[PDB]
Design an enzyme around this catalytic site. Structure first.
Site, PDB file in Angstrom:
ATOM      1  CB  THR A   6      34.146  37.597  44.556  1.00 48.90           C
ATOM      2  OG1 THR A   6      32.796  38.055  44.654  1.00 48.90           O
ATOM      3  CG2 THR A   6      34.796  37.631  45.924  1.00 48.90           C
ATOM      4  CD  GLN A   7      40.131  40.123  40.426  1.00 46.38           C
ATOM      5  OE1 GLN A   7      41.284  40.323  40.812  1.00 46.38           O
ATOM      6  NE2 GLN A   7      39.704  40.523  39.240  1.00 46.38           N
TER       7      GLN A   7
ATOM      8  CG  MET B  57      28.974  42.135  42.099  1.00 43.17           C
ATOM      9  SD  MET B  57      29.404  43.215  43.484  1.00 43.17           S
ATOM     10  CE  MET B  57      29.778  42.005  44.753  1.00 43.17           C
TER      11      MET B  57
ATOM     12  CD  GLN C  82      31.692  38.789  48.639  1.00 46.54           C
ATOM     13  OE1 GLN C  82      30.511  38.827  48.981  1.00 46.54           O
ATOM     14  NE2 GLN C  82      32.152  39.490  47.615  1.00 46.54           N
ATOM     15  CG  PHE C  83      34.645  43.340  45.418  1.00 41.63           C
ATOM     16  CD1 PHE C  83      35.479  44.419  45.663  1.00 41.63           C
ATOM     17  CD2 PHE C  83      33.606  43.501  44.513  1.00 41.63           C
ATOM     18  CE1 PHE C  83      35.288  45.626  45.010  1.00 41.63           C
ATOM     19  CE2 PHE C  83      33.418  44.709  43.860  1.00 41.63           C
ATOM     20  CZ  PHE C  83      34.260  45.768  44.109  1.00 41.63           C
TER      21      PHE C  83
END
Ligand SMILES: [Mg+2]
Lengths: 244, 233, 250, 240, 211, 235, 222, 5, 231
Positions: free
Chosen positions: B1-2, B107, G1-2
């Site tokens: 997650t970035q 992810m 959030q991705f």
């Protein structure tokens, strides 16, 4: 590679013997004699210290007789360093059992597990076996007073009276001669010392060259006491039986 | 997650009769702050491919290093590294597309939208898009970010389908790209006036143009606009 | 690659001997004489500083090592093997005792931990035994003063007094005549210097002899004041000057 | 980890470590298995060079794997404990997953599989043990007697012996055991087992152990006096 | 909706054939009975993939059993392989309801309910799925041990029809099975489109509906 | 000593060559392939008369369409059969079909050379793998511990192999019936076997497309033995 | 959030005849309200007379098709160039999909070809591997529009024989390749009118014993 | 999406 | 002698005997021939049988649509190396959408065989391979030896009596190299080449194994009645 330098410690001879176990037993046969005698009202452990020096500290010394828990003790014959590895394992195993079941470990269960560790070193791992034979003296509420022996093979057997280390052949004949089933602790104490006194390679048996311990129900009402004899207490018991 | 920090905006591109054109402004935005002004977002790979990258600039610089290493690795034990076994646009794209999808699947994406523009060994035009999700698609015109919303409509008026590509010259195609970059400067709040443009022609090869500026802008009509409704002064 | 020696290099011979331990003891025999004497109010450990070269600074090489503030160690045999054992002995005193009980281990238990390390080098895969015998002198509240010998096998014995290495046979005979249970610490240091002169051949002074004691607490060597219960280390290394003072009245 | 291939082929196509494990079995005390019409009997030799023994606490030669299956053995005593432990764990694991106790064949196949694994695993030697596994399958009255050996081969036997002088007692059983008519009763089966051991043992005092297994988890070990009665009866009939 | 009940003449197994994705009716022709072997059946309710994947897997494990043991697996052992499997995945979000129905010599006709939260129950009657309550209502009020094979087959069929009608997430068609000592017997696919009107007319039931 | 995976000067693996000597000591196993089916027969060879011969399992089912006979250190075959059964069922789970006999054999033969310093030594057992599939029909394979497998019209392995193989060379033709093949296995087994052949010390099996893999009863084999003796006396 | 998933829109349609099968799909690729491509094929010839489409999240769809194509290649290597039957392919794809049960491929998969009797076969998969053979299946954005029309026109659902008092159903029969392509084109023109993610172009792959033929038709581009 | 009687 | 116990030991003259013993396993193997023109590359392999009742050991393996090899020596080792090539060819396709160069195929096999000759416990591969392929730089023929040495050639042969076929190809070099756009004539030249390695036995229908790859020809193997044309 490294194959060149591998002794192959865990293999069979053409005759179906384990080389390293047989050679470990040969090692143990030169170790100071240790005798266990089981009476109806207690157990005796007697052991001869290996050629003592006059400047050895005798009172604060432990070579032969070790305490595993409050109810079980062992007499050692062989490499002391090897024995202490196995003793610390046995002490931990006893506490694991107590922690799990809130009951003191039955003698045979402790003996079997310690014997199962020795067995492991003869079948796998490519390491040398433990050059140690034990006499287990202990009490539990199932079988009462029990004597066992284990050897580097990891094979264990129960006994009424047994010797390990040096001159077991001569020692076992003398025990077989004078032992009887209705024997008391005080009588067993006398037999243990008389046997060492005759089988010893020393000139005369003295207090400073002995380790002695009893496991009696001699405490107050239905409880077991372990007595690891002090130098002065061995000196007194040696005079009382008329050896010195 | 970035979360993307330093970002590049629209990358726009289109096919023409003999090759492909790709363009992107020279800005590295830090949110609303236009922090870096000397950022090259078109990265040539050999003499037959240009990779235009938008999104996170730290991840763009990572992809630069991968492509640079890909050229080195391809040269190893390869006597035909500058001939038959030279890197193709299709090879470079499929590599990036593999990485982009592997990173999204862990992810931990590369926060980018990438357009690989080039010409294959057989003279065929190559133009394909890939993004942080590993999503890939090809079209006569491709654009990222605001470019997709504002450039594509203008570029599609020139090349609306496949049959329009042979009818489109490099002069007409470049004119449309330069016009699209002006419109993006009018309307994209994270765009700059300064941009780079690259042409990969099957005849004249790779032409890389730096330090281009949006010009011939219409602002004069602004002086006539007073207030927001009623105000006359 | 990788350590393929996962098998024992020490094994039982048909006669029941553990060859590598016997050969390790032979290496200890060749080693320079070291001794330990236990008094009523202290313990002394001493050895000769065999200098490899006169250009070498024998002060930098310490044969007598502090393990804890109240425990010291000296050896006979292979110096390098000793040095790494001291490192491991100091660390195990912390990891397996002090970090659990908030106090230093008693002599017998630290000896037990060192013995364990040396036993493992006798049975573990792809290693030889340590080629050293240790003499560990120490004090603790409940056992008082004690002196232990540790052999390559991992076997340890408590001693009133003993010697190990080159001239141990003669040195042990000398100690039997002189040792009694009423010896004061100063008397034990005197006997230690007499015993060691027999085995030493060349120069016999404070610069060629290394000697340390386990005696009274040393508040001056603690390095701080304010905590009454902390009274300082019982381990003290005698200086070159302090030895020479006792060699005049010899 | 210790990796060395200890069990390997020789030019003549033999695995000497497996064959030397059989020599260890041949050294071991004699063990005999005889199955009758409605029972199996496991007889075991105990060498009489050991006096001052404590027979209460000394590990028994016959081991219960479950309430319905028993395992006797010949060879290294220490090795036998590892097989028995594994077998006992597998017996409880089978009840847990299949909701049914092991068949004697299944328990044998497992123990035999363990013995085989130690003949082509790195860093280990074969088990110096042959086992006789006897009992009755759940809700079944047909007697089962199986033998295993270090190599890992196993097979079913009407009657079989293993250990020292086993070739002598096998010779005895081969002429005395009728396939068409096995021992009809418990007494007949025990007597034939004791008779077979008396060819080899020495004295019929505290040298012979007998364990009788019957259907529906009915296992009992005979005492000294009970066995001594069979010894006394056989010797009186012999003098003829 | 799927049921399985034990009676005088063995086991009846009945299932619907509907598959839903929310309110979207995705299929009306899904096979919710898995034929593990000539003597074993498995019913499927919950996650379509979870049920379909793990019950075909169960069939593989039951085949390996009879190869290794030279004997058909018990209903108990077969159900417990599946229950021990789903229990390993407990909390991971598997959605499976199944009844393992079959016959063996030692057990006789046996039904085991197994669900994705590790529950394993032996029983004579089970109704599982979104429409289980509708099936229970009809089945329980007409069930007797002494039902004929003909009446038992009908009650099982009629119980699914009842649930197919009222439950929005049940319908399509009824798949009937009868398990005897000789193995399972298929008793046809019955489309609710024709079956409802046929039952209404012949039985005189479903008076709530405009005839 | 010496490495387990060592080459001889002649260019052969010592341990593989030594394992082949172990297989020659094993009991005889014969396989014959016809257009009507594949027959597998074995010598049981009970070490003692007290041993219940029916417990000697040297013919083994892998799947409904694949059978297996073994010769040599038969204990080693258990993990090979276990692998074969898993491979066969696993393929059916992944592809909703029967697995090719060749593909099954190849899967078993991949274990063979997975030994060294993986398991400690090669397998001391040879396998005759017989089966049927839609593509290549009735097939017989000889799987060695070398990791090599040959397809055979007929094949003998074990102590009496070279004698039995020479006999199969003369007797085998492409038009053999299943009944003819059954008798031919019994005939050649009786020749090379030490003890006299009967239903108790020899076992027959076959695999047909229709009925799949079947081990014959002692009653069925006894009639084929009686049929065999009568036909040899008839000329 | 991705968010690792996306919706690339589009719709696919599989119909099975007596001796043929069609797998159709629009060529439009979208994200939100933007068109990415007017011609991005998502119906592929995978070999062994199997055609495949994985509609939904294009990245997951391309990955699955890529992995299945690779599965067919290795099936040849490992099983002596044996032809992968449509039923065997379907089961293989179940294991591909279910292998990622706890991080699914967000796709509706359809494959079409011929069964081992030479008859037209269509298999349809949910995102986690549940599959079913059908005469008829629509998947993707406009599946809810097209599917009930196919029920009516392919399987003749809710259609009775005139004058039979709604007692005799319209009899089932196989459709000609000509009649099937009419239903496909009318299905996609109807879906294009009423669904914003459907349009641009229609690509049909027809599978007979002779091989895999392609047909392309323009759709409205609004 | 996935399908779920 | 004392230096052939394992692959990790050098001889006093700097030889690796275990690698040389692995090389010996190839010489015992059945003959196989490789040759190419500018348009096509051909493998011809003499298959070997156990006896008349047995099948003929398959010598040729397909690695991709554009690449494959023939084997001589340990067949299981050829299966391991061919499987590795299949994966490397496949990796090149999935990741780079790129057909693996026959030269890189050789480099990858060389490096895989080498690691087995420098480490304790392992052994050298006991098989020789002839890799043919058609890539972006035209037709190719490689000779793999389990020492690790890979060599690009116009033609070659490995196995028993391979010297006969290798001498013939050395004479015929100028002829067969220019057989462009003619598959059947290039095979004929390969079949005539392998014929120079025959003793007592001749090429039969179930004995001969041919494979071809080229410009508009995928890697395909011909066995049984499909090779009856070339006898
Ligand atoms: Mg539209």
């Amino acid at each position: 590679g490294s194959r060149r330098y591998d002794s192959r410690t865990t293999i069979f001879s053409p005759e179906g013997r384990l080389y390293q176990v047989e050679y470990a037993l040969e090692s143990i046969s030169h170790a100071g004699t240790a005798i266990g005698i089981m009476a109806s009202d207690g157990i005796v452990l007697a052991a001869e210290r290996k050629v003592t020096s006059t400047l050895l500290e005798q009172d604060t010394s432990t070579e032969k007789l070790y305490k595993l828990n409050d109810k079980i003790a062992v007499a050692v014959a062989g490499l002391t360093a090897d024995a202490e590895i196995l003793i610390n394992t046995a002490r931990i195993h006893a506490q694991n059992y107590l922690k799990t079941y809130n009951e003191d470990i039955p003698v045979e269960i402790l003996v079997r597990r310690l014997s199962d560790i020795k067995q492991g070193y003869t079948q796998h791992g490519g390491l040398r076996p433990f050059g140690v034979s034990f006499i287990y003296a202990g009490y539990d509420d199932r079988y009462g007073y029990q004597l066992y022996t284990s050897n580097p093979s990891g094979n264990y057997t129960g006994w009424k009276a047994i010797s390990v280390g040096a001159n077991t052949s001569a020692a076992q004949t003398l025990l077989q001669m004078d032992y009887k089933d209705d024997m008391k602790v005080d009588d067993a104490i006398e037999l243990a010392l008389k046997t060492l006194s005759k089988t010893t390679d020393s000139s005369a048996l003295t207090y400073d060259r002995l380790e002695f311990a009893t496991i009696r129900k001699g405490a107050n009402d239905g409880e077991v006491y372990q007595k690891i004899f002090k130098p002065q207490e061995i000196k007194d018991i040696l005079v009382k039986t008329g050896i010195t | 997650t970035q979360q993307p920090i330093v970002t590049g905006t629209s990358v726009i591109s289109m096919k023409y009769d003999n090759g492909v054109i790709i363009a992107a402004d020279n800005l590295g935005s830090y949110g609303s702050l236009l922090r870096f002004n000397g950022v090259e977002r078109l990265i040539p790979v050999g003499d037959n491919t240009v990779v235009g990258i938008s999104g996170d600039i730290s991840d763009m610089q990572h992809i630069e290093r991968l492509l640079k290493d890909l050229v080195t690795e391809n040269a190893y034990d390869n006597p035909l590294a500058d001939a038959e076994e030279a890197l193709e646009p299709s090879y470079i794209f499929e590599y990036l597309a593999t990485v982009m999808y592997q990173r999204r699947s862990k992810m931990n994406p590369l926060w980018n939208a990438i357009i690989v523009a080039g010409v294959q060994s057989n003279g065929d035009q190559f133009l394909r898009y890939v993004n942080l999700l590993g999503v890939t698609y090809s079209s006569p015109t491709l654009a990222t970010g605001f470019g997709a919303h504002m450039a594509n409509p203008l570029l599609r008026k020139v090349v609306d389908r496949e049959s329009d590509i042979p009818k489109t010259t490099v002069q007409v195609a470049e004119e449309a790209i330069v016009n699209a970059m002006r419109v993006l400067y009018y309307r994209d709040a994270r765009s700059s006036r300064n941009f780079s443009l690259a042409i990969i022609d099957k005849n004249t090869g790779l032409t890389f143009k730096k330090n281009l500026q949006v010009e011939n802008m219409k602002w004069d009509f602004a002086k006539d606009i007073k207030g927001y409704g009623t105000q006359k002064i | 690659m990788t350590d393929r020696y996962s098998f024992s290099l020490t094994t039982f011979s048909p006669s029941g001997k553990l060859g590598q331990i016997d050969y390790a003891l032979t290496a200890v025999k060749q080693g320079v004489t070291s001794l330990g004497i236990k008094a009523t109010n202290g313990v002394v450990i001493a050895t000769e500083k065999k200098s490899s070269s006169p250009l070498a600074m024998s002060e930098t090489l310490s044969k007598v090592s502090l393990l804890t503030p109240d425990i010291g160690a000296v050896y006979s045999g292979m110096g390098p093997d000793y040095r790494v054992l001291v490192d491991k002995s100091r660390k195990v005193a912390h990891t397996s005792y002090k970090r659990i009980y908030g106090e230093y281990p008693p002599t017998k238990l630290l000896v037990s931990e060192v013995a364990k390390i040396m036993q493992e080098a006798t049975q573990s895969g792809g290693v030889r035994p340590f080629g050293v015998s240790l003499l560990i002198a120490g004090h603790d509240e409940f056992n008082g003063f004690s002196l232990y010998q540790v052999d390559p096998s991992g076997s340890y014995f408590p001693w009133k007094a003993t010697a190990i290495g080159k001239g141990s046979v003669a040195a042990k005979t000398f100690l039997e005549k002189r040792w009694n249970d009423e010896l004061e610490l100063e008397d034990a240091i005197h006997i230690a210097l007499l015993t060691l002169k027999e085995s030493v051949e060349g120069e016999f002074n404070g610069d060629t002899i290394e000697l340390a004691i386990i005696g009274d607490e040393n508040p001056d060597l603690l390095g701080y004041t304010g905590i009454p219960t902390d009274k300082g280390p019982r381990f003290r290394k005698l200086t070159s000057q302090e030895i020479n003072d006792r060699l005049e009245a010899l | 980890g210790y990796d060395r291939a200890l069990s390997i082929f020789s030019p003549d196509g033999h695995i000497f470590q497996v064959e030397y494990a059989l020599e260890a079995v041949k050294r071991g005390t004699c063990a005999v298995g005889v199955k009758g019409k409605n029972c199996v009997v496991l007889g075991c030799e105990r060498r009489s060079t050991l006096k001052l023994q404590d027979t209460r606490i000394t590990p028994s030669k016959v081991s219960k794997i479950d309430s319905h299956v028993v395992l006797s053995f010949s060879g290294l005593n220490a090795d036998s404990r590892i097989l028995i432990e594994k077998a006992r764990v597998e017996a409880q694991s089978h009840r847990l997953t299949l909701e049914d106790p092991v068949t004697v064949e299944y328990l044998t196949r497992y123990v035999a599989g363990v013995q085989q694994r130690y003949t082509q695993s790195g860093g280990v030697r074969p088990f110096g043990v042959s086992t006789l596994i006897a009992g009755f399958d759940p809700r079944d009255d047909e007697p089962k007697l199986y033998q295993t050996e270090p190599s890992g081969i196993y097979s079913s036997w009407s009657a079989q012996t293993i250990g020292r002088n086993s070739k002598t007692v096998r010779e005895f059983l081969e002429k005395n055991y009728d396939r068409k008519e096995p021992p009809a009763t418990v007494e007949e089966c025990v007597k034939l087992t004791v008779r077979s051991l008396l060819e080899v043992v020495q004295t019929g005092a505290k040298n012979i152990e007998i364990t009788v297994v019957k259907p529906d988890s009915d296992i009992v070990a005979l005492s000294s006096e009970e066995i001594n009665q069979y010894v006394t009866q056989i010797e009186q009939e012999k003098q003829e | 909706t799927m049921l399985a009940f034990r009676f005088q003449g063995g086991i009846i197994v009945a299932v619907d054939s509907r598959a839903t994705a929310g309110n979207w009716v995705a299929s009306q022709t899904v096979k919710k009975v898995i034929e593990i072997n000539p003597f074993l059946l498995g019913t499927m309710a919950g996650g379509a993939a979870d049920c379909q994947f793990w019950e075909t897997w169960l069939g593989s494990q039951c085949r390996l059993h009879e190869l290794r043991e030279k004997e058909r697996i018990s209903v108990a052992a077969a159900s417990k392989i599946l229950s021990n499997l789903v229990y390993q995945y407990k909390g991971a979000g598997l959605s499976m309801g199944t009844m393992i129905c079959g016959y063996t010599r030692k057990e006789g006709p046996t039904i085991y309910y197994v669900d994705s939260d590790g529950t394993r129950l032996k029983g004579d009657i089970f109704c599982v799925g979104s429409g289980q309550t509708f099936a229970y209502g009809v089945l329980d009020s007409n069930y007797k041990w002494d039902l004929s094979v003909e009446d038992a087959l009908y009650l099982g069929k009629r119980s699914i029809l009842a649930a197919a009608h009222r439950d929005a997430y049940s319908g399509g068609s009824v798949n009937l099975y009868h398990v005897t000592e000789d193995g399972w017997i298929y008793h046809g696919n019955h489309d609710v489109g024709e079956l409802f009107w046929k039952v209404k007319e012949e039985e005189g039931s479903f008076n709530n509906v405009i005839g | 000593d010496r490495g387990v995976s060592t080459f001889s000067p002649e260019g052969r693996l010592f341990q593989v060559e030594y394992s082949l000597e172990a297989i020659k000591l094993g009991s005889t196993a014969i396989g014959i392939a016809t257009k009507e089916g594949v027959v597998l027969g074995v010598e049981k060879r009970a070490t003692s008369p007290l041993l219940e011969s029916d417990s000697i399992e040297k013919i083994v089912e892998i799947d409904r369409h694949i059978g297996c006979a073994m010769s040599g250190l038969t204990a080693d075959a258990r993990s090979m059969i276990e692998h074969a059964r898993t491979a066969a069922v696993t393929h059916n789970l992944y592809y909703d079909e029967d697995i090719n006999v060749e593909s099954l054999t190849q899967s078993v033969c991949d274990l063979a050379l997975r030994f060294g310093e993986l398991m400690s030594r090669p397998f001391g057992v040879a396998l005759l793998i017989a089966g049927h599939d839609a593509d290549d029909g009735y097939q017989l394979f000889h799987a060695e511990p070398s990791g090599t497998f040959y397809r055979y019209n007929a094949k003998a392995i074990g102590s009496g192999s070279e004698g039995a193989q020479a006999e199969l060379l003369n007797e085998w033709h492409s038009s053999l019936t299943l009944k003819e093949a059954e008798l031919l296995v019994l005939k050649i087994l009786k020749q090379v076997m030490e003890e006299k052949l009967d239903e108790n010390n020899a076992q027959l099996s076959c695999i047909t497309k229709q009925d799949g893999f079947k081990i014959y009863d002692n009653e069925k084999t006894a009639e084929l033995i009686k049929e065999l003796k009568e036909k040899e006396a008839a000329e | 959030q991705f968010n690792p998933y996306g919706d690339n829109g589009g719709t696919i349609l599989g119909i099975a005849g007596e001796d043929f099968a069609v797998l159709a799909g629009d060529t439009r690729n979208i994200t939100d309200y933007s068109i990415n491509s007017r011609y991005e094929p998502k119906v592929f010839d995978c070999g062994d007379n199997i055609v495949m489409s994985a509609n939904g999240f294009a990245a997951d769809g391309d990955a699955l098709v890529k992995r299945f194509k690779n599965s067919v290649k290795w099936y040849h290597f490992d099983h002596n160039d044996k032809k992968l039957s449509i039923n065997s392919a379907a089961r293989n794809i179940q294991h591909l999909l279910y292998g990622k049960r706890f991080f699914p491929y967000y796709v509706h998969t359809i494959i079409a070809g011929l069964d081992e009797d030479g008859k037209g076969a269509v298999y349809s998969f949910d995102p986690v591997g549940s599959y079913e053979r059908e005469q008829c299946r629509a998947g993707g954005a406009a599946a809810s529009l097209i599917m009930p029309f196919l029920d009516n026109q392919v399987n003749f659902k809710n259609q009775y024989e005139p004058g039979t008092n709604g007692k005799v159903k319209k009899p089932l029969k196989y459709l000609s390749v000509e009649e099937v392509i009419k239903l496909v084109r009318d299905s996609f023109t109807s879906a294009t009118e009423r669904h914003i993610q459907v349009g641009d172009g229609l690509e049909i792959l027809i599978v007979t014993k002779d091989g895999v033929r392609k047909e392309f038709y323009e759709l409205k581009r609004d | 999406x996935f399908l779920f009687x | 002698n004392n230096y052939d116990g394992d692959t990790v030991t050098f001889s006093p003259t700097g030889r690796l005997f275990q690698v040389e013993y692995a090389l010996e396993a190839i010489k015992q193997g059945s003959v196989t021939v490789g040759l190419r023109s500018n348009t096509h590359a051909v493998l011809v392999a003499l298959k070997r049988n156990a006896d008349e009742l047995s099948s003929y050991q398959k010598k040729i393996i397909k690695c991709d649509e554009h690449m494959g090899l023939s084997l001589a020596g340990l067949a299981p080792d050829a299966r391991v190396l061919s499987n590795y090539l299949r994966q490397q060819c496949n990796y090149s396709s999935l990741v780079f959408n790129r057909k693996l160069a026959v030269e890189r195929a050789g480099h990858l096999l060389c490096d895989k065989a080498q690691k087995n000759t420098q480490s304790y416990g392992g052994r050298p591969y006991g098989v020789g391979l002839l890799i043919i392929g058609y890539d972006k730089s035209g037709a190719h023929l490689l000779e793999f030896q389990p020492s690790g040495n890979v060599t690009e050639l116009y033609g070659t042969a490995i196995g028993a009596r391979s010297q006969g076929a290798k001498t013939y190809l050395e004479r015929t070099l100028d002829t067969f190299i220019k057989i462009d756009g003619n598959p059947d004539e290039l095979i004929k030249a390969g079949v005539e080449a392998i014929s120079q390695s025959l003793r007592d036995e001749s090429l039969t229908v179930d004995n001969l194994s041919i494979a071809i790859v080229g410009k508009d020809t995928p890697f395909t193997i011909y066995d049984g009645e499909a090779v009856a044309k070339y006898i």
